[PDB]
């Protein structure tokens, strides 16, 4: 199934008393640990909303963007998924003022494209130092926009791993009326986020399961081969 109750083994967990109070309506009272739990039913409906809206945007042929910069776990997952399917991404920290203006981004990415295609044209004609620094600049441009080269226009849809951790990204997103979906952990502002998926990020198992489900949701809509469609079974991936 999808978002099965019995399929999941570790969905609770959070540092207590660091949460925004109005996020308590989507959480049931704690039993012993006071580590913020989550009502799995509303999680299921939120994931269903995400699933149907990603199908809808797939019919619209909209551009998808993945945003995540946590230490290693979701970073590795997003890198693997991004090299698996066509989607914009970023591994370095979110550049201040990226979404708010794309004209400078457009000319910079055009510069990146012309330089990389000139490297492709070049056959090591340039001397060791010239192409050495040119390749260093190419690698720097890969560090900067090596994940957002797959689009020329505004991002038609974007996921946020954590708006608190990505305050700049969600702040830029609030400026524009483009649809934005995020993962409210326990301490976010619902008015900034458009579609809400109150899942957990304090544990890596929850993050991997949810990202796998959403990646399958956004992949199977495009009729590309997928990994999980309606299978209750899942792959266990414990953090190193």
């Amino acid at each position: 199934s999808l978002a099965k109750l019995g399929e999941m083994r570790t969905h609770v967990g959070m540092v207590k008393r660091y949460w925004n109070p109005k996020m308590g309506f989507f959480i049931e009272p704690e039993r012993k640990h006071n580590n913020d739990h989550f009502v799995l039913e509303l999680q299921r409906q939120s994931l269903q909303t995400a699933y149907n809206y990603v199908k809808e945007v797939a019919q619209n042929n909209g551009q998808i963007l993945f945003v995540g910069t946590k230490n290693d776990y979701v970073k590795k997952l997003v890198n693997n998924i991004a090299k698996r399917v066509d989607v914009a991404f970023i591994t370095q920290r979110w550049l201040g003022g990226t979404l708010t203006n794309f004209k400078t981004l457009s000319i910079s990415i055009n510069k990146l494209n012309k330089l990389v295609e000139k490297q492709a044209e070049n056959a090591a004609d340039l001397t060791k130092k010239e192409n050495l620094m040119l390749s260093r600049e190419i690698e720097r441009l890969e560090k900067f926009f090596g994940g957002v080269k797959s689009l020329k226009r505004l991002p038609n849809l974007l996921i946020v791993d954590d708006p608190v951790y990505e305050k700049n990204a969600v702040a830029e997103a609030n400026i524009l009326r483009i649809p934005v979906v995020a993962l409210c952990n326990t301490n976010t502002n619902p008015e900034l986020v458009d579609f809400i998926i109150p899942a957990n990020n304090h544990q890596p198992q929850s993050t991997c399961l949810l990202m796998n489900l959403l990646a399958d949701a956004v992949a199977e809509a495009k009729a590309m081969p997928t990994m999980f469609a309606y299978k209750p079974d899942e792959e266990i991936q414990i953090e190193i």
Binding site: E56, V57, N60, P179, D194, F195
Partner: peptide
């Protein structure tokens, strides 16, 4: 929201 189809 949800008016994008």
């Amino acid at each position: 929201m949800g008016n994008f189809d």
